[PDB]
Short mmCIF file of C-alpha atoms in Angstrom, two decimals:
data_model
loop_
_atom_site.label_atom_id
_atom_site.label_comp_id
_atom_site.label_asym_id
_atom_site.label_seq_id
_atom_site.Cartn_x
_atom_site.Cartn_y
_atom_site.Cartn_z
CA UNK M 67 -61.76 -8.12 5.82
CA UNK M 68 -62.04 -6.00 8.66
CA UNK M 69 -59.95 -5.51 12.16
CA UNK M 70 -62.78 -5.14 14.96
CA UNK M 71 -61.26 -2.57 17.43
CA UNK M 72 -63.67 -3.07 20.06
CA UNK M 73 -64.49 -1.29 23.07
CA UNK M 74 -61.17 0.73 24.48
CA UNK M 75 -61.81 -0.93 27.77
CA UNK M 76 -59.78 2.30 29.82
CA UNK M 77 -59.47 0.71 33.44
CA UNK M 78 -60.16 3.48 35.70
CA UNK M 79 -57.60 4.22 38.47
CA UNK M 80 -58.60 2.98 42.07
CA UNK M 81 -58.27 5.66 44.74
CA UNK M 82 -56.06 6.06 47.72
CA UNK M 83 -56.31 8.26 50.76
CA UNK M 84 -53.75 8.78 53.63
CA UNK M 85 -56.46 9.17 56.78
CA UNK M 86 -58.35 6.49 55.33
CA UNK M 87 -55.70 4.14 55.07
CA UNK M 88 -54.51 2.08 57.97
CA UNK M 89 -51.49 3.85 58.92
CA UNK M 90 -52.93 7.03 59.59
CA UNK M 91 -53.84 5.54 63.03
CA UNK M 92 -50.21 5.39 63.81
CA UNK M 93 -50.01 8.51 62.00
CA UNK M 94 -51.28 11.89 62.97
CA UNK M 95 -51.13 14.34 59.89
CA UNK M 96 -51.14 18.32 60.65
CA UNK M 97 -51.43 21.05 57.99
CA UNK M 98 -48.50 23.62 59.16
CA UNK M 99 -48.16 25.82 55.69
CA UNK M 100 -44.38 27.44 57.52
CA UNK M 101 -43.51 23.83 57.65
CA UNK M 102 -40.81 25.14 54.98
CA UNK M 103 -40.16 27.92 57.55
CA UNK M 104 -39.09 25.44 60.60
CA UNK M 105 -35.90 24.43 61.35
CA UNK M 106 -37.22 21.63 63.59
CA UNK M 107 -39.87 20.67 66.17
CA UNK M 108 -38.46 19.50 69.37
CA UNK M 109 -40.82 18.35 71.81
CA UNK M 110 -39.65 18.94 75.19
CA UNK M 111 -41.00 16.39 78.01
CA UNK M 112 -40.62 16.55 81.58
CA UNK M 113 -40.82 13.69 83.67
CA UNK M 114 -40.92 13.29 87.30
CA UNK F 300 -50.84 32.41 54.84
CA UNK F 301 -50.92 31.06 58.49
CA UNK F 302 -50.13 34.57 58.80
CA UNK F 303 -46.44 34.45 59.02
CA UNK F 304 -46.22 35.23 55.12
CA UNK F 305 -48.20 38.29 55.73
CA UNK F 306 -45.77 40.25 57.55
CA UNK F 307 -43.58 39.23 55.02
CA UNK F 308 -45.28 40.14 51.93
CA UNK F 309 -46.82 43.34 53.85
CA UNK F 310 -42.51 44.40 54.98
CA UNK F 311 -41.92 44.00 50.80
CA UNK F 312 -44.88 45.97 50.15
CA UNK F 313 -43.34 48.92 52.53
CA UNK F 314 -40.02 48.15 51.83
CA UNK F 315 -40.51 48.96 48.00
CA UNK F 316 -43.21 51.71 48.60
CA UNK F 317 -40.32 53.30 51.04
CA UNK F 318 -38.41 52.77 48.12
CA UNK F 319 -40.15 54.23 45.73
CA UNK F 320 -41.28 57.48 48.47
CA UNK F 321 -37.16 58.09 48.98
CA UNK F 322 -36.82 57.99 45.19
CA UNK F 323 -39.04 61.03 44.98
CA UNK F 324 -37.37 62.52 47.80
CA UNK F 325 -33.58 61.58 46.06
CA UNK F 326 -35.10 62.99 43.25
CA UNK F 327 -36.57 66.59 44.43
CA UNK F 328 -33.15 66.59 46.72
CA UNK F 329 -30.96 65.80 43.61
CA UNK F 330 -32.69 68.87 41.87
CA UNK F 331 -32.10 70.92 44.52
CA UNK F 332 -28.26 69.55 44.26
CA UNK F 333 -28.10 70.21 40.42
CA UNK F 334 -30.04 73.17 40.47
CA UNK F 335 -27.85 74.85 43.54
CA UNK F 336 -24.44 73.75 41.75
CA UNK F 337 -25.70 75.17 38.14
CA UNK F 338 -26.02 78.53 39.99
CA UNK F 339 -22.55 77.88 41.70
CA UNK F 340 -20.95 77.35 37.98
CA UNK F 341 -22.87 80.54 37.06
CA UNK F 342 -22.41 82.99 39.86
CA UNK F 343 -18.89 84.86 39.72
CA UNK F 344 -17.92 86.38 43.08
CA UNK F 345 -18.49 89.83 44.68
CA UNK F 346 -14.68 91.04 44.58
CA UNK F 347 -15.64 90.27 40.53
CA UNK F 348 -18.94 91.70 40.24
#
């Protein structure tokens, strides 16, 4: 008799990136490292 | 650091070296303290002496 355990066939993980997705170009992604020192950002505009 | 941690981490740095610098100076004052009251428990007055 025997059992044949062949070839562990260990799928490897496909990759994902946010920039390279799609929605980073409705997305624009900043690095701010006293993003946990904020309150807020608030944008002022002024419009004629 | 985008540098706003610096002055942080920099103000603890002082803060406990300040710390540790009026320690010393508790310290030297406090034997000054002890050292002025051990002569006050061991010095009788002049109408005694």
């Amino acid at each position: 008799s025997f059992e044949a355990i062949f070839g562990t066939y260990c799928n490897k993980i496909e990759w994902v990136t946010f920039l390279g997705t799609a929605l980073a170009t409705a997305a624009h992604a900043i690095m701010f490292h006293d993003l946990n020192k904020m309150t807020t950002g608030k944008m002022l505009f002024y419009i004629q | 650091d985008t540098l706003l941690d610096k002055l942080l981490n920099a103000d603890a740095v002082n803060t406990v070296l300040r710390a540790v610098k009026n320690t010393a100076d508790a310290m030297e004052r406090g034997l000054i303290d002890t050292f002025l009251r051990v002569l006050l428990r061991h010095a009788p007055p002049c109408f005694v002496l």
